[PDB]
């Protein structure tokens, strides 16, 4: 971080906008738009699907299904999957035992 600070100081000491005639106004407008855009981005993330805490675990579960023969690519149930659907408990182990 300190090295990044040093490099940022080095870059800050050479800006061309500081010498531009229209430095303050355009800059404040840029501040407003970036702040608002960032707030929108966070808002959309809260409104998106990645906000769900358990989504990576859902993906991991579908992958575990796909390595065995229960779900086709793009999520269509296979015969073993529909067999393990109507099962009381330990669906995976019992249906795997049946096919083996």
């Amino acid at each position: 971080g300190g090295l990044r600070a040093r490099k940022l100081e080095e870059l800050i000491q050479g800006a061309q906008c500081v010498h531009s005639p229209r430095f303050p106004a355009q800059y404040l407008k840029l501040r407003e738009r970036m702040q608002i855009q960032k707030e929108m981005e966070r808002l959309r993330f809260l409104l998106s699907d990645q906000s769900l805490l358990l989504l990576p675990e859902y993906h991991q579960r579908v992958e575990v299904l796909r390595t065995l023969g229960y779900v086709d690519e793009a999520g269509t149930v296979k015969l073993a999957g529909r067999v393990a659907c109507a099962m009381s408990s330990h669906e995976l182990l019992l249906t795997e035992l049946m096919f083996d």
């Binding site: 149930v77 296979k78 015969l79 529909r82 067999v83």
Partner: protein, 132 residues
């Protein structure tokens, strides 16, 4: 005559198909049932064009198209594919494609169609018979 709807058109086509099938199966004639088959195709095509978003009409046209007297397999394959696309949950259409592939010496691809079809409906009889 007094109420022109699509379902009656499709049923009329199926009835003409049955009459032709009966005449052929008793060896009673051949090449004298041609008009009956063309009438059947005409009725099914009229029904399909009347409402071309129904898997039933595409499926019926496909099955008739592959009758031994007509023997137009490309149209049958097209009709079954259209029926499958129209409504994806269709074991009947998949099994009919499986039969089409199986009779024309395509064991692998017919196996693919039958296995997927029973994947969609585990208690359909014809898919199991095809697998056997």
């Amino acid at each position: 005559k007094l109420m022109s709807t699509s379902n009656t058109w499709c049923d009329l086509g199926i009835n003409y198909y049955r009459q032709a099938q009966h005449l052929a199966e008793t060896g009673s004639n051949m090449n004298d049932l041609k008009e009956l088959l063309e009438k059947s195709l005409h009725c099914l095509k009229k029904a399909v064009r009347l409402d071309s978003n129904n898997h039933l009409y595409w499926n019926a046209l496909g099955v008739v198209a592959c009758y031994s007297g007509i023997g137009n397999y490309a149209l049958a394959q097209h009709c079954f594919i259209k029926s499958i696309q129209s409504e994806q949950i269709n074991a009947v259409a998949w099994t009919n494609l499986g039969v089409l592939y199986l009779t024309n010496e395509n064991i692998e691809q017919a196996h693919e169609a039958f296995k997927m079809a029973q994947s969609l409906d585990p208690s359909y009889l014809m898919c199991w018979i095809g697998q056997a």
